[PDB]
Amino acid sequence: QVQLMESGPELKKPGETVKISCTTSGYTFTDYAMHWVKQAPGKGLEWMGWINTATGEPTYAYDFKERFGFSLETSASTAFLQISNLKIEDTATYFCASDGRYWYFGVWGAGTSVTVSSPKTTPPSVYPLAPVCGDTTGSMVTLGCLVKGYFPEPVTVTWNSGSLSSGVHTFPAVLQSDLYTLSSSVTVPSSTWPSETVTCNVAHPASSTKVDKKIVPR
Amino acid sequence: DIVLTQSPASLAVSLGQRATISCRASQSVSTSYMHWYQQKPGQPPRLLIYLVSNLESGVPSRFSGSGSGTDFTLNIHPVEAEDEATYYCQHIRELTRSEAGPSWLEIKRADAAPTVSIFPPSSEQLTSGGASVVCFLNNFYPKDINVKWKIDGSERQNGVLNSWTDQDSKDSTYSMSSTLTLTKDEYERHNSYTCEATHKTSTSPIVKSFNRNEC
Amino acid sequence: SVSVQTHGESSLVNKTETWLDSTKATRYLMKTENWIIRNPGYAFLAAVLGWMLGSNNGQRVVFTILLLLVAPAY
Amino acid sequence: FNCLGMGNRDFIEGASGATWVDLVLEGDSCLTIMANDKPTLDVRMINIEASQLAEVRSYCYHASVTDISTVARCPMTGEAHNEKRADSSYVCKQGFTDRGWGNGCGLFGKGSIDTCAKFSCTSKAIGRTIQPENIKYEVGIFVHGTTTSENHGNYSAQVGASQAAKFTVTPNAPSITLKLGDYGEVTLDCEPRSGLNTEAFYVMTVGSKSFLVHREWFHDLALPWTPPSSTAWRNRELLMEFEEAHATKQSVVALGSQEGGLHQALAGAIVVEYSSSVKLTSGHLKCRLKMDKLALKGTTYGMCTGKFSFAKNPADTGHGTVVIELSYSGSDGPCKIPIVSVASLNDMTPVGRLVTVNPFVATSSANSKVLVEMEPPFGDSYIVVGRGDKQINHHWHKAGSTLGKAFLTTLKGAQRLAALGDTAWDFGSIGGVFNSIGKAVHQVFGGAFRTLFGGMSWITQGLMGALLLWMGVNARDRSIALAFLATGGVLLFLATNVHA
Amino acid sequence: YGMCTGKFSFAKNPADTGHGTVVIELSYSGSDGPCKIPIVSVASLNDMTPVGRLVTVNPFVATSSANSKVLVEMEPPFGDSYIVVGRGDKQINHHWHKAG
């Protein structure tokens, strides 16, 4: 079976170098070129180029030239994407492909998310959020959990060990000083709080911090 | 040399109704050489139509389309919840090979008003020196929405952090979380905090307010 | 140009129906026959040149049938 | 994958003596091997596959004129220069405008102008170059066991019985060993990169479809062409023209789409489709079939004790053999199916040979269809299925008697000599001496002579051959055949081979 | 050094040097090294008699580390030949032809 796996999420800093690996299976490696496609932070897919594999020849898209590279290893069927002088604007997801030439490809790579930032590994600030009188609308009391300033991704935010997923919305996090801030809100009826325990469980194995915070009434 | 754009960029339509994407290619007479990609956010796409008449292996028969030269189409008569994704397309003949500004499928439902809950910063954050006032907008449809942080009746755009999800898997609505970040001293020098949420459903912004002097 | 100097014939393997096969027999003759019908007055004096020189009989036609094929499309 | 109902089905007469054989195959043709201890085999090409294709160049056949600009100048000024000569996108050309005192100038009879027009390509063709390792070959191989009208034309069904197999031979792995199960294993050693000539030609894409073109003719095409990367082209002035110059007015006009001219430029090109891997129709590959492990099992099985029936009626395969399908209603199975091909009913001596050796009932289930093929002799024969009162027979007659068949081997043999080049003697398999020198004499004769003046098209080499036949008329004793050498054969033959 | 007991691989694909010889690069995945690399240049597969001569004499594995690339060149004979690397089932071969 043809399945393209890549190096996983990579943590980088501006000014360094990286070689992004693409490991291929199900076919002879030198027989298919590797189409490299960058996904811009705005979710634009920007095509990096294709490497003639035989012959080991990279073909760059002009915008990607001279700070990027395509290198290969034939025996283990691993294609490599080399990047020099890392830049924060390069934070993105990268992809490889098994070449069907001018019709492109039938199989997409697993993807590689490069993160170029200059933070310190940090545990999140996990705050139980007490709803006020105006926060109780329509028989339900909405509760929330602020996850503030954690690096790196991901964080597992559950509620009462994940026992109640009903009204749980775990929102994405964006960059603040290269730190991530997200919030998660559980929606339970007003009869369940503060009658029943509601505790947001934030598991951040990257910083090795599992935080448990219960919301208390005011 | 060729410019590609896909429209409508966001299409709200119920499952089973036909969706015909109006699409074009600037550099003309591509012959056919036009494709279609469906990509959910945070994933690689999947090639839908090649030869403009023909599916790939995994893509089911519900996908179709036609065109030549400039204009091309993606016609899915039985759109489905599995079809929810960001539709992409890409060109051949000349080089370099490039794509179009994409188009979103959205499954249509009844317009829903947001559930707005504005939480004062925790006592743990105040002791940390900062104060982040969060505003949760849950289960609203469509995605068009706005948050305005009114401090003592005056709107503040500073420290506003807006985190909203995509179209949900369960109810297919949108959920938004707005965050107003301040310092504790700046938090204690301002009294009334409210996030007014205007939406296509409610002709007036939904106002959830609290004051530090109140509770 | 694209009008002349056709790919035909490949003549490598190729037992199949090519792009143009049955029309390959109509390439020269019919277009050269449409030329000699276009110019009959030439065809009268054309074959005359064969009987002029050499007095070798049968090879005098070798002149004509070859030379009458020269004039069309040069 | 099998030889059932194929357009061209050719056979192989086993002389035994060796377990290995070197045979050439094709996409349309299906070889059939019949040998002692070795069941009946099917060997054919599915198609020719290629994995990675590099972009050699492109060709713009259809263009349009944009932004006509002509800078007028006075006579005696020499060259005219338009500012558009800086960009390569603008197509500029010198020229002149005859001037009076009426238009733009104070002198007569001469002028100078620079006519620039921005080039715009509406449509362009693209070529592709074939790498030798990237070439793949899907070769259907099949052995004839108990079969039906369904499973025999089915692949995965015979894979469950291990009677059919597919595989991909590449220069990286030319040797593949596949097992036939109960009948043993066979080893196939092919020559993927010498089957075709990878660098002899290109793959040209005209419009949506792609086609094959010789690479030396590919570069000799006269039409605006394109470098691999992006921008600057050559001979793009050919799709555009010029006119007379009246004052500053000159109209650059573009030729129409040359796609038809490209389709006119294609004559002997093979239509080729593609999806993720290109599939070529007519195959050429040199493989080695090793039958050493292939053997016969269940000859231990005795005859079937019960009535037969015809699942389908007999007919002629057109290749010289007769196939039948039999539904055996007896429950004594598994049993060896009694059957023969005889001259007369009063003579029980078998004459015709079974194409499918050792007919066998799969399972004890009654009314189980079995498809077995046989080759009857020439003249009136009989297909007799079963022994005793249990037998139901059929009358057969085949008019192909060896007189005409001797020419069918002869004439097609020369047709096998033509178009296959030096590989034509691979039908001389398990060769040496004769077959070795027969190819060797034709080797340098294939590397010279016919290939030296090769490139002649149809009547070109055919007509002059009739004039070269006259060279055999005028000659001297012992010099007769000298002018006659290349005349007869190798020249008029291929002219008679392709008529049309 | 006796023969190597384990699978081979191509670090780079074979080609012609243009001077009349054929060079290959091999990544040996076996851990039995250091060992003399089995390899030959033969006429046919059914004939194990070596015909072509190795340009680089006595191919050898540097260290026991697996997947160690080794580049060895050979001169095949004229006509259809084969590059065979290894003995037994372990061998992976290639077809070569030289018109010179």
Q: End-to-end distance of chain B based on CA atoms, in angstroms? A: 63
- Could you say which DSSP state residue C31 is in? H
Chains B and A touch (3+ CB pairs under 8 A): yes
Residue of chain E whose Cα is closest to the Cα of D193: E95
- Which of A27, A101, A106 faces D53 most closely, judged by CB atoms? A101
Judge contact between A147 and A173, C-beta under 8 A.
Answer: yes
Judge contact between D372 and D356, C-beta under 8 A.
Answer: yes
CA-wise closest residue to D394 among D413, D381, D411, D407: D381
Cα gap D274→C63, rounded to integer Å: 51
Q: Which helix (H) or strand (E) holds D15?
A: none
Backbone CA torsion sign across B101, B106, B111, B114: negative
Method: cryo-EM
Residue of chain C whose Cα is closest to the Cα of D61: C2
Contact state of A101 with D128 under an 8 Å Cβ cutoff:
yes
- Could you say which DSSP state residue D358 is in? S
The radius of gyration of chain B's CA atoms, rounded to the nearest angstrom, is 23
CA atoms within 13 A on the CB side of D138: 16
Contact state of B32 with D230 under an 8 Å Cβ cutoff:
no
Which residue(s) pair with D127 in the sheet? D204
Backbone angles phi, psi at A115, to 5 degrees: -120, 110
Contact state of A55 with E10 under an 8 Å Cβ cutoff:
no
The radius of gyration of chain A's CA atoms, rounded to the nearest angstrom, is 23
Backbone CA torsion sign across D388, D389, D390, D392: positive
A136, exposed or middle or buried, with CB in 10 Å at 0-12, 13-18, 19+?
middle
Residues in contact with A101: Cβ distance below 8 Å, sequence separation at least 6, in sequence order: A33, D52, D53, D128
Under CATH, to which class is B109-212 assigned?
A: mainly beta
For residue D32, give how far its alpha carbon lies from the nearest alpha carbon of chain C (Å).
Answer: 19
Cβ contacts (< 8 Å) between E94 and chain D: which residues? Answer: 171-172, 174
Cα gap B146→B140, rounded to integer Å: 11
Under CATH, to which class is B6-108 assigned?
A: mainly beta
Q: Which helix (H) or strand (E) holds C37?
A: helix C29-38
Q: Which chains touch C (3 or more CB pairs under 8 A)?
A: D
Cβ contacts (< 8 Å) between B94 and chain D: which residues? Answer: 121, 124
CA distances from A136 to A141, B136, D63, D456 (A): 5, 12, 69, 92
Residue D135: strand, helix, or coil: strand
Q: By the CB < 8 Å criterion, does D194 face chain E?
A: yes
Q: Which helix (H) or strand (E) holds A120?
A: none
- Which of E44, E94, E97 faces D172 most closely, judged by CB atoms? E94
CA-wise closest residue to A56 among E55, D215, D137, E10: E10
Cα gap A166→D21, rounded to integer Å: 71
CA-wise closest residue to B134 among A192, A200, A197, A138: A200
Across the A:B interface, residue pairs with CB atoms under 8 Å apart total 125
- Which of A28, A55, A103 faces D276 most closely, judged by CB atoms? A103
Cβ contacts (< 8 Å) between D133 and chain E: which residues? Answer: 13
Give me the amino acid identity at A109. G
Q: How many CB atoms lie within 10 A of CB B180?
A: 23
Contact state of A185 with B117 under an 8 Å Cβ cutoff:
yes
Q: How many CB atoms lie within 10 A of CB D367?
A: 11
**DSSP codes, B41-104:** TTS---B-EETTTEE-SSS-TT-B--B-SS-B--EESS--GGG-SEEE-BB-SSSS--BEE-EE
Residue of chain D whose Cα is closest to the Cα of A50: D54
CA-wise closest residue to A28 among E66, D283, D169, B57: D169
The whole-angstrom distance between residue D374's C-alpha and the CA centroid of its chain comes to 29
Judge contact between C3 and D264, C-beta under 8 A.
Answer: yes
Cα gap D495→D462, rounded to integer Å: 5
For residue D86, give how far its alpha carbon lies from the nearest alpha carbon of chain C (Å).
Answer: 29
Cβ contacts (< 8 Å) between D17 and chain E: which residues? Answer: none
Resolution of the PDB structure in angstroms: 4.7
Task: Give Dmax (Cα) for chain D.
Answer: 117
Backbone CA torsion sign across E86, D429, D3, C12: positive
Q: By the CB < 8 Å criterion, does C24 face chain D?
A: yes
Q: To the nearest 10°, the Cα dihedral for D73, D78, D83, D85?
A: 130
Cα gap D497→D464, rounded to integer Å: 16
Q: By the CB < 8 Å criterion, does E92 face chain D?
A: yes
Judge contact between D272 and C16, C-beta under 8 A.
Answer: no
Cα gap D225→D223, rounded to integer Å: 6
Strand A125-129 to A136-137 pairing: unpaired
- Which of B43, B124, B165 faces A127 most closely, judged by CB atoms? B124
Output the six-digit token pair for D34.
């019949």
Length of chain A: 218
Judge contact between B63 and B3, C-beta under 8 A.
Answer: no
CA atoms within 13 A on the CB side of E42: 16
Q: Which helix (H) or strand (E) holds D462?
A: helix D459-473
Chains C and B touch (3+ CB pairs under 8 A): no
Judge contact between D277 and D50, C-beta under 8 A.
Answer: yes
Backbone angles phi, psi at E93, to 5 degrees: -115, 175
- The segment(s) of chain B belonging to CATH 2.60.40.10 are 6-108, 109-212
Cα gap A74→E8, rounded to integer Å: 12
Output the six-digit token pair for B42.
């945070």
Tell me which residues of chain D have a C-beta less than 8 Å from any C-beta of chain A.
51-55, 126, 128, 131, 133-134, 136, 170, 172, 205, 274-277
